[PDB]
């Protein structure tokens, strides 16, 4: 029905924080996912680009 794509770059090891029910710096201050989140998470290495 309505699909939205978010884009953000993190320090790599913080990929575990982008998930429902997770806590941390990015999870609590920058980007938080609700417990009823229904979607997909796509993360790849960008050490050559960014």
């Amino acid at each position: 029905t309505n699909v939205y794509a978010d884009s953000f770059v993190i320090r790599g090891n913080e990929v575990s924080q982008i998930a429902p029910g997770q806590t941390g710096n990015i999870a609590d201050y920058n980007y938080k996912l609700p417990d009823d989140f229904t979607g997909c998470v796509i993360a790849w290495n960008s050490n050559k680009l960014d």
Binding site: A19, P20, G21, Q22, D35
Partner: protein
């Protein structure tokens, strides 16, 4: 003879025993790591504590 009202005594005895075992069933660990919901919520993340 105190054993004249044995039926009326056993009725409330069985009722109290059922209440006691229903209370004790809360201390059971039905495949979980603990019988307290607060401990499970504080130890594991929501996706795993579900």
């Amino acid at each position: 003879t105190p054993s004249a009202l044995g039926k009326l005594q056993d009725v409330v005895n069985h009722n109290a025993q059922a209440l006691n075992t229903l209370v004790k069933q809360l201390s059971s660990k039905f495949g979980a790591i603990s019988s307290v919901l607060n401990d499970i919520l504080s130890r594991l993340d929501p996706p795993e504590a579900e």
